[PDB]
Ligand binder design. Structure first.
Ligand SMILES: CC(C)(C)c1cccc(C(=O)NCC2(NC(=O)c3cccc4nocc34)CCCCC2)c1
Ligand SMILES: CC(C)(C)c1cccc(C(=O)NCC2(NC(=O)c3cccc4nocc34)CCCCC2)c1
Lengths: 244, 244
């Protein structure tokens, strides 16, 4: 083993649909991370923490109306069991549309935790007091309406799993340059000559320039948090001028 | 049947990991939408469109380096087969970090399509010319680094499935008011009295006010695209003043 024994990542998940998480534990990069014991994903289902015959996991809001909520007691008890399994130092995250907007800086922050517990909402969400009593942070993957927090949780797991030592073992955070692979001519469209030139120093400059221009045109906000290198500033200035 | 015969939604998916999509086709709201034939999700795997013995689906970039790309020919041919199955009028969406940022306005737009084809990238993505020759629109669920476009595609499916007639059959786009359910007192924390008052007109005003304040404090950008009602402007002004 090349990876130190205490660098694996543990993520507890609280969800009414634990089987959804097979999508990240059995496929692709995260799938290989679980199989090689770099990532452990453990799920607790609030349905298993009910005591009534029909395993009721939703409840009605005070004040009335059709917007059902997650029942407090089964959710809270699932969370308490995850905390017990985690031991000390687990950070409890509620995936929620009222949370801090997730971005790569945020992922980096979250990935500094060896132990995470992710709480996925269903119905109209969870009791506000549970946020105060059980939740450490609220995070959102975007401003759109979903039917559950499970896809956001899986998105977050995918994003932080890239930071686990053994997986793959900020300029990269800019948008990619255009990518080209075989064939040389695709329905009449040709690869930029420099890319097929074998001049790897020219290729390097070209790719960096294209990445900068594309970030500039499609996500300029990403540049606002960076003090670019001299080369990057030079290439970006060139691309900006040539774009007129 | 209460729902017209031609209002079902069809979504073709192009992905190296079709089994991931079980997470949306077999669970929750989308799961029920598929079972009741309101939503149809059909997947094509580029691996099935290869002709070499080891079913190779990645290729090397012109110009070199470790960043592998999706092999053009199997991906393109999977897309062509999805287009054939779709028939006329299917919109082809590439889930991509260089795409338009998804928000609820964007979801609403996408949901006006009866037929969508979603292309999920792996490795470092797809050949730029394929975007020109096969892709209609690029969309991104957020600014963070993922290992595949499958979770974004599923997120998008979850978001647009809410617009299908028979599922559930812009003020709602503001952040929710705080939600409260049983018990009346949770670890000493009490429900706001108005909510347990039975005064449903007071409750309505309180919930709207709280929703506005919370949108104001946590997602003010959402208010920039709306001309609020007189009641909403009155309640928001009150919450803003009382927040000092
Ligand atoms: C103004 C805005 C953002 C459009 C909005 C406004 C009001 C409600 C929602 C919404 O989607 N309620 C449903 C709910 N969503 C999420 O869990 C969720 C959604 C999006 C990004 C996320 N990241 O993590 C979790 C996320 C799932 C069921 C349990 C309650 C939360 C959205
Ligand atoms: C500047 C920024 C955004 C941080 C960034 C910069 C450079 C690369 C990436 C990135 O994630 N490349 C990997 C890749 N991502 C996605 O598919 C993807 C990610 C996020 C939101 C999405 N919505 O749809 C699809 C999305 C999966 C493998 C195939 C190539 C794309 C990200």
């Amino acid at each position: 083993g090349l990876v130190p024994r205490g660098s694996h990542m543990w993520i507890g998940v609280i969800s009414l649909f634990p089987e959804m998480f097979k999508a990240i534990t059995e496929f692709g990069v995260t799938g290989r991370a679980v199989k090689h014991n770099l990532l452990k994903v453990e799920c607790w289902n609030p349905r298993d923490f009910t005591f009534d015959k029909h395993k009721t996991v939703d409840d009605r809001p005070y004040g009335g109306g059709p917007g059902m909520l997650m029942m407090v007691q089964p959710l809270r008890d699932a969370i308490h069991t995850a905390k017990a399994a985690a031991g000390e130092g687990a950070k409890v995250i509620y995936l929620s549309p009222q949370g801090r907007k997730l971005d790569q800086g945020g992922v980096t922050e979250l990935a500094q935790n060896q132990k995470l517990i992710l709480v996925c909402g269903r119905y109209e969400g969870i009791d506000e007091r549970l946020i105060q009593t059980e939740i450490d942070e609220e995070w959102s993957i975007g401003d759109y309406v979903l039917t559950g927090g499970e896809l956001p949780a899986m998105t977050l797991i995918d994003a932080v799993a890239r930071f686990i030592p053994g997986v793959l073992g900020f300029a990269d955070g800019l948008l990619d340059c255009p990518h080209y692979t075989r064939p040389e001519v695709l329905e009449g469209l040709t690869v930029p000559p420099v890319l097929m030139s074998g001049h790897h120093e020219e290729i390097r400059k070209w790719r960096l320039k294209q990445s900068l221009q594309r970030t500039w045109l499609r996500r300029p906000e990403l540049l606002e948090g960076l003090a670019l290198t001299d080369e990057q500033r030079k290439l970006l200035k060139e691309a900006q001028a040539e774009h007129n």
